[PDB]
Design a protein around this ligand. Structure first.
Ligand code: CPS
Ligand code: RET
Ligand code: R16
Ligand code: D12
Ligand code: D12
Ligand code: D10
Ligand code: DD9
Ligand code: DD9
Ligand code: DD9
Length: 226
């Protein structure tokens, strides 16, 4: 009965509900272009639901020694993030007709971000936890820079309704993702200032907003149609 369970349960509920909702709407769609946005966007909270439910049930948690103490670390988050973050980036890229080489660079930076975040979360030398954290943040900032500078440029060649939707979704992405590195720094993985229950609260609000909120904006737009 870990106190954070309540936010793991509410995350499960919300990701499950948004998945079913996106699935129902997406199955009703015949436009093949919108279909592609629904498939990507429905899979995102579906991965997040299975990870939240795993953690809810006691999996995806390990203990890592650092600072003279055994610290609980939820590693299943990175299993979620590894696939959902590039799926999110793809949605953006498809919206703006981004180049293939841009997408590959993006997904790559994304993989580094989550990969180094995870190595950081498991590292037993306290100071080195932060080296990995900084590397992961650096990769993240590359991706935000691409979304904000490169994808907006591409967005400007699209019809205004598409560019407008891109911009809301880009803004939501910049705000939410920029917060994760800060929560990790001050929370359980990092300085141990924010307790595990509050930090789980913070990730759940970030995750739901960034996946269901994101998908609610994309999937209700005219922007996704051929
Ligand atoms: C029965 C199994 C494993 C036993 C071996 C244990 C391990 C983790 C447990 C859950 C979580 O702790 C969160 C939550 C705490 C609440 O208190 C009551 C409900 C809930 C969903 C728990 C129920 C149950 O107790 C679980 C499934
Ligand atoms: C649905 C989940 C989302 C949108 C997750 C976003 C996660 C990140 C942007 C992760 C960022 C991290 C860093 C920038 C460095 C340290 C730890 C990581 C994984 C949390
Ligand atoms: C053409 C030139 C150059 C350069 C470079 C850039 C710098 C760096 C940093 C960082 C970050 C963030 C991003 C964005 C977002 C809204
Ligand atoms: C329960 C979950 C569902 C759904 C998701 C997914 C999207 C992938 C299927 C599209 C392949 C044609
Ligand atoms: C093709 C591999 C993707 C990476 C391309 C550029 C950049 C980045 C990043 C990383 C981090 C410190
Ligand atoms: C002892 C401090 C180690 C610093 C190494 C960081 C290099 C990674 C650059 C990407
Ligand atoms: C892909 C980045 C590799 C950098 C290794 C950092 C060394 C940590 C002490
Ligand atoms: C010895 C202090 C380390 C310096 C921190 C710089 C981190 C930049 C990402
Ligand atoms: C505004 C948040 C500050 C939290 C730090 C206070 C915790 C005391 C150890």
């Amino acid at each position: 009965g870990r106190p954070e369970w309540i936010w793991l349960a509410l995350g499960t509920a919300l990701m499950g509900l948004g998945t079913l909702y996106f699935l129902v709407k997406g199955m009703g769609v015949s436009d093949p272009d919108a279909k592609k946005f629904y498939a990507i966007t429905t899979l995102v909270p579906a991965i997040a639901f299975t990870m939240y439910l795993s953690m809810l049930l006691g999996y995806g948690l390990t203990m890592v020694p650092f600072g003279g103490e055994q610290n609980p670390i939820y590693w299943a988050r990175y299993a979620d993030w590894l696939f959902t973050t590039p799926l999110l980036l793809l949605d953006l890229a498809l919206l703006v007709d981004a180049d293939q080489g841009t997408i590959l660079a993006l997904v790559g930076a994304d993989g580094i971000m989550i990969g180094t975040g995870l190595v950081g979360a498991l590292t037993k030398v306290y100071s080195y936890r932060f080296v990995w954290w900084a590397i992961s943040t650096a990769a993240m900032l590359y991706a935000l820079y691409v979304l904000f500078f490169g994808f907006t440029s591409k967005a400007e060649s699209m019809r205004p309704e598409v560019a407008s939707t891109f911009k809301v979704l880009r803004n939501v992405t910049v705000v939410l993702w920029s917060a994760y590195p800060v929560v990790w720094l001050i929370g359980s993985e990092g300085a141990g200032i924010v307790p595990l229950n509050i930090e789980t609260l913070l990730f759940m609000v970030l995750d739901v907003s960034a996946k269901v909120g994101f998908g609610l904006i994309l999937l209700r737009s005219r922007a996704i149609f051929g």
